[PDB]
Amino acid sequence: VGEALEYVNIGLSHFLALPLAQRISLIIIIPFIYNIVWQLLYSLRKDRPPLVFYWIPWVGSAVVYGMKPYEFFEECQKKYGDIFSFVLLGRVMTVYLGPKGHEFVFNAKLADVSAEAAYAHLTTPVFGKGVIYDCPNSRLMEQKKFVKGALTKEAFKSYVPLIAEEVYKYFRDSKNFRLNERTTGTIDVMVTQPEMTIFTASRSLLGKEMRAKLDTDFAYLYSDLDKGFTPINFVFPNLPLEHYRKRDHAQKAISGTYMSLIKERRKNNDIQDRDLIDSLMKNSTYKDGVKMTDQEIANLLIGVLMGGQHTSAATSAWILLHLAERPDVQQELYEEQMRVLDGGKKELTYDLLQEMPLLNQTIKETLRMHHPLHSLFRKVMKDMHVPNTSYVIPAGYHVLVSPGYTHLRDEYFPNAHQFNIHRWNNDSASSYSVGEEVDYGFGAISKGVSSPYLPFGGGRHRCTGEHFAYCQLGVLMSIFIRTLKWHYPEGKTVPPPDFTSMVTLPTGPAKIIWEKRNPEQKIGGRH
Ligand code: HEM
Ligand SMILES: C[C@@H](c1ncncc1F)[C@](O)(Cn1cncn1)c1ccc(F)cc1F
């Protein structure tokens, strides 16, 4: 029976003869049907985690994961346990929930997983080339080592009065406050916190020159570049549209400003220990002798500042929002300010910040309820066996880990959805290496990453901005608490999170009503 093969060919010929309606109709029915037939077959493998079923091909569970990622995970965890895959915008994501997932992903061997393959398409078009994820891991490890050189205790000692002054200036001059002229007012915390975060971070990490730029129309380039930081970069990283060209123009104009300051400092040999720019100028030689270019130094600055912008601004937005319905906590924090700072007669110092455990537990608890990053990912480079299982995660998959999900589990945090800074009494550290330690190129960090509380990640990709974030959030909240009481308009409460930015932001407009503790207090200086 070669007669059959002839009819194969005849059928192929008649196929290409169909009316164009039926040919496009067939162009959609065939992949859909195949997609379901493939999942059903896939769901038989014993060496693959369960795969979340989905109707639309390529799209996958993208809509559900994107809008309600922790709800998606809880549903999947109830059905399939702690390991399961789901299709997402063309990728397969293998999720591993809970502390053993933290260990599987955050401590995966450098050979098995790649962060830069996962992230580069999100960050490289915003930050620029050659740094962070547009470079091999060992370069990244050392860039973190260079940034850490400016994030020392002694640096934080000089940043505290800089950050504090910036907050007072903001209270004095910003339209949102004007404390010298109003005793009460209403703000949207998603306007005020992003602005306060960029002003305080610029002044301390970037220096006075870069801070001064933000009082000009130059500040619009930060807005344009900020807009370019979006999950759309995973599908359309470059499209010949205005959004993208404004992004690229901002990246070039902003990195040009940094290089101009860098080259002017070197031209005058004016390199002190003022800011992170001084620091990187003195210290950006890799261990194989290669030196970072002024452009790579500038792109590193953008990426570090931009990442710290979003996480910190989100977090201080959430602190304000939780305290607006917790007058008890504001009272509690105010008393600690009065006791640590001798009734407000002692100036805030970095040392005194460490003696304010309730303030630091408020940051800590906010990073529990509202982790700014619901998902961290790697691309799997070599097949991985899931220990004590029959599961194998093949190369070309992605592993996804979500400590923010574990932060919200009653099993690890009793009453996980109640905001209680006292769940941290006797434990106000920003995190804790609770045992051994290892160095990946930027300093010794906890060897284990099994803690259920992992707001700053762990392993080779762990955050290097933790202590800067606490310093900055600490000075800002110390001043907010000693200066203002605040509350919600009638009937309003803590807004639910918006996860689509991939930074967990309050849903707007998130407004609070502030009023001066001392209506007669005046903020000195010029305006
Ligand atoms: C509330 C504040 C912050 C939180 C909760 C936070 C959280 C995190 C987390 C969870 C990671 C691990 C990423 C991964 O494993 O994929 C990370 C990495 C990182 N963060 Fe932060 N971060 C914060 C603030 C900052 C700040 C202020 C800076 C800079 C001053 C910064 C710079 C970095 C850097 C350089 C990395 C390393 C990424 C890598 O190795 O690939 N972060 N952060
Ligand atoms: C890649 C990015 C991210 N954003 C959102 N969901 C997951 C993510 F991994 C992020 O980790 C965010 N971030 C972490 N600490 C501060 N910012 C990041 C890290 C380093 C950096 F230099 C810039 C930067 F954006």
Q: Which residues pair with 51 in a beta bridge?
A: 85
Distance CA 310, CA 430 (A): 18
**What CA–CA distances, in Å, run from 332 to 22, 77, 341, 470?**
70, 38, 14, 19
Question: In this structure, which ligand is nearest to the CA of 226?
Answer: 2
CA atoms within 13 A on the CB side of 363: 30
d(CA 51, ligand 1 centre) in Å: 30
Task: Give the residue, by CA position, lying nearest to ligand 2 atom 25.
Answer: 307
Distance CA 162, CA 167 (A): 9
378 φ/ψ angles, rounded to the nearest 5 degrees: -135, 155
Amino acid sitting at position 265 = R
32 φ/ψ angles, rounded to the nearest 5 degrees: -60, -50
**What is the signed CA dihedral for 105, 106, 111, 112, rounded to 10 degrees?**
0
Q: Are 51 and 39 in contact (CB under 8 A)?
A: yes
**What CA–CA distances, in Å, run from 240 to 28, 243, 247, 434, 458?**
28, 9, 12, 50, 38
- The binding site consists of 119, 133, 144, 378, 461, 463
Task: Give the residue, by CA position, lying nearest to ligand 2 atom 13.
Answer: 307
Amino acid sitting at position 432 = Y
**Resolution of the experimental structure, in angstroms:** 2.4
Q: Are 199 and 219 in contact (CB under 8 A)?
A: no
**What CA–CA distances, in Å, run from 99 to 254, 350, 458?**
40, 33, 11
Closest CA to 277 of 160, 155, 166: 155
Is the bond preceding 509 in cis, omega lying within 30 degrees of 0? yes
Closest CA to 172 of 483, 526, 523: 523
Q: Which residues pair with 395 in a beta bridge?
A: none
- What SS3 state is found at 279? helix
* 353: Cα separation from own chain's centroid: 24
d(CA 137, ligand 1 centre) in Å: 15
Q: Are 250 and 306 in contact (CB under 8 A)?
A: no
Ligand 2 pocket, residues with Cβ under 6 angstroms: 119, 123, 132, 303-304, 306-308, 311, 373, 376, 463, 502-503
Question: In this structure, which ligand is nearest to the CA of 313?
Answer: 1
Task: Give the residue, by CA position, lying nearest to ligand 2 atom 20.
Answer: 307
Q: Which residues pair with 376 in a beta bridge?
A: 401
Q: In what order do the strands lie in the sheet with 91-96?
A: 83-88, 91-96, 398-401, 376-380, 113-114
Query: How long is the chain?
Result: 527
Strands 113-114, 83-88: pairing kind: unpaired
**What CA–CA distances, in Å, run from 206 to 173, 199, 216, 272, 502?**
21, 10, 16, 13, 26
Strands 437-439, 398-401: pairing kind: unpaired
- What SS3 state is found at 72? helix
Question: In this structure, which ligand is nearest to the CA of 302?
Answer: 2
Tokens at residue 493, please? 């409460």
Q: Report which ligand 2 atom has the smallest distance to the Cα of 373.
A: 6
Closest CA to 265 of 241, 294, 245: 294
Phi-psi region of 86 (alpha: psi -120 to 50; beta: other; left: phi over 0): beta
* 504: Cα separation from own chain's centroid: 8
Task: Name the one residue in this structure whose structure tokens are 């994030």.
Answer: 151
Distance CA 372, CA 308 (A): 11
Q: Are 510 and 189 in contact (CB under 8 A)?
A: yes
Residues 6 or more apart whose CB falls under 8 angstroms from that of 167 comprise 196, 200, 475, 476, 479, 480
Strands 398-401, 91-96: pairing kind: parallel
For the chain, the helix, strand and coil percentages under 3-state DSSP, each to the nearest 5? 50, 10, 35
d(CA 179, ligand 2 centre) in Å: 34
- Give the ranges where 43-130 is alpha helix by DSSP (H): 62-67, 69-80, 99-106, 115-127
Distance CA 201, CA 312 (A): 10
Strands 83-88, 392-393: pairing kind: unpaired
Per residue, the 3-state secondary structure of 122-180, as one string, reads HHHHHHCCCCCCCCCHHHHHHHHHHHHCCCCHHHHHHHHHHHHHHHHHHHHHCCCCCCC
Pick the CATH number of 122-516 from 3.40.50.150, 1.20.120.450, 3.40.50.300, 1.10.630.10: 1.10.630.10
Question: In this structure, which ligand is nearest to the CA of 373?
Answer: 2
| Domain residue ranges of the chain, discontinuous segments joined by + | 122-516
Pocket of ligand 1 contains residue 146 by CB under 6 Å: no
* 336: Cα separation from own chain's centroid: 30
CB atoms within 10 A of CB 262: 20
Helix (H) or strand (E) holding 20: helix 20-42
Distance CA 223, CA 233 (A): 17
The one-character DSSP state at 272 is: -
d(CA 311, ligand 1 centre) in Å: 8
Q: Are 315 and 193 in contact (CB under 8 A)?
A: no
Amino acid sitting at position 215 = D
d(CA 517, ligand 1 centre) in Å: 34
Q: What is the DSSP string of 447-494?
A: S----S--TT--GGG--S-HHHHHHHHHHHHHHHHHHEEEEPPTT--P
Method: X-ray
Task: Give the residue, by CA position, lying nearest to ligand 2 atom 15.
Answer: 307
Distance CA 421, CA 415 (A): 12
Phi-psi region of 431 (alpha: psi -120 to 50; beta: other; left: phi over 0): beta
Tokens at residue 123, please? 């960050």
Per residue, the 3-state secondary structure of 348-394, as one string, reads CCHHHHHCCHHHHHHHHHHHHHCCCCCCEEEEECCCEECCCCCCEEC
- What SS3 state is found at 434? coil
377-387: buried (b, 16+ CB within 10 Å) or exposed (e) per residue? bbbbbeebebe
Q: What is the separation, in whole angstroms, between the first and last Cα of the chain? A: 94
User: Given ligand 1 and candidates 193, 463, 505, which is best to mutate, with the most ligand atoms within 8 Å of its CB?
Assistant: 463
Distance CA 250, CA 247 (A): 5
The one-character DSSP state at 495 is: P
Residues 6 or more apart whose CB falls under 8 angstroms from that of 307 comprise 465
Q: Are 392 and 47 in contact (CB under 8 A)?
A: yes
Closest CA to 206 of 162, 174, 264: 162
**What CA–CA distances, in Å, run from 503 to 105, 230, 314, 368?**
20, 9, 8, 14
Q: What is the DSSP string of 232-268?
A: GGGT-S--SSHHHHHHHHHHHHHHHHHHHHHHHHHHT
Q: Are 224 and 249 in contact (CB under 8 A)?
A: yes
Tell me how many degrees the CA angle 364-369-370 measures, rounded to the nearest 5. 90
Q: Report which ligand 1 atom has the smallest distance to the Cα of 132.
A: 41
**What CA–CA distances, in Å, run from 41 to 34, 36, 46, 51, 475?**
10, 9, 11, 11, 57
d(CA 458, ligand 1 centre) in Å: 10
Tokens at residue 236, please? 């359309």
Tell me how many degrees the CA angle 161-356-341 measures, rounded to the nearest 5. 60
Q: Which residues pair with 400 in a beta bridge?
A: 95, 377
Q: Are 324 and 512 in contact (CB under 8 A)?
A: yes
